[PDB]
Amino acid sequence: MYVKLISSDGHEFIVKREHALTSGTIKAMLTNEVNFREIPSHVLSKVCMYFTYKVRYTNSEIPEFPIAPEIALELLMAANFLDC
Amino acid sequence: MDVFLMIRRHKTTIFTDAKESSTVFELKRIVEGILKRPPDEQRLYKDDQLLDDGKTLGECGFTSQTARPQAPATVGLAFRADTFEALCIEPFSSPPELP
Amino acid sequence: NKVGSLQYLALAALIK
């Protein structure tokens, strides 16, 4: 039901399995635990919020998805890697 | 309406959702399902303020405007060790700065 | 209503 995503700085993010399958890369992985040696906390947290935001508002007026310009490049790289 | 939450203790974040009409107790059950510690072994906090088990999440300040999928609200989680630890939440890594 | 891919959203955030 839930999967555990681990960041490079050792944070664990417990997300619903169905939400995490928004990522094509993660969907290719799947135990209940995926390790990311290259994605830091402040990026992986946003990635997780994206999963939920997408599942909820896909086929919904859609509110903005907030991204600080300071995290955007790292987020871009992460999202590319994650295929989402 | 649904509320979206990051339940946080130390370096662990649970991304979950509940209803505004959910009691704090129901949240503790979700946490029990994930972390295998029953409701009476948990304290939940918002804004350094202890949450009452019998209150709805909405009464506690978790609303659709406040706890959104793009921008979830944090709930702090403290476990009974006999004695409850003080709230320990580790920050995420610091975002870089621009040029 | 369709949610944009995170790559697109992240790039749009660099444009701003």
User: Could you please report the per-residue DSSP string of B26-72?
Assistant: HHHHHHHHHH---GGGEEEEETTEEPPTTSBTTTTT--TTTSBTTBP
Q: For the residues of chain A, what is the DSSP string, one character each?
A: -EEEEE-TTS-EEEEEHHHHTTSHHHHHH---EEE-SS--HHHHHHHHHHHHHHHHHTT--PPP----TTTHHHHHHHHHHHT-
CA pair distance A39, A20, nearest whole angstrom: 15
| Side chain identity at residue A20, one-letter code | A
CA angle A44, A49, A51 (to 5 degrees): 95
Residue B67 buriedness (CB in 10 A; 0-12 / 13-18 / 19+) = buried
Chain A residues with CB inside 8 Å of C16's CB?
A: 69
Phi-psi sector, A48: left (phi>0), alpha (psi -120 to 50), beta: alpha
Q: Distance from CA of residue A67 to its chain's centroid?
A: 13
Q: Given this structure, which CATH class describes domain A1-84?
A: alpha beta
Residue B3 buriedness (CB in 10 A; 0-12 / 13-18 / 19+) = buried
The residue among A39, A76, A82 with the most chain C CBs within 10 A of its CB, best to mutate, is A76
Nearest CA distance, C4 vs chain A (angstrom): 8
Domains and CATH numbers, chain B: 1-99 (3.10.20.90)
The residue among A51, A56, A67 with the most chain C CBs within 10 A of its CB, best to mutate, is A67
Taking the domains of chain A in order of start, what are their residue ranges? 1-84
| Side chain identity at residue A65, one-letter code | F
Please tell me the experimental approach by which this structure was elucidated: X-ray
Resolution (A): 2.4
CA pair distance A29, A37, nearest whole angstrom: 15
Chain B residues with CB inside 8 Å of A45's CB?
A: 6, 13, 92
CA pair distance B32, B38, nearest whole angstrom: 5
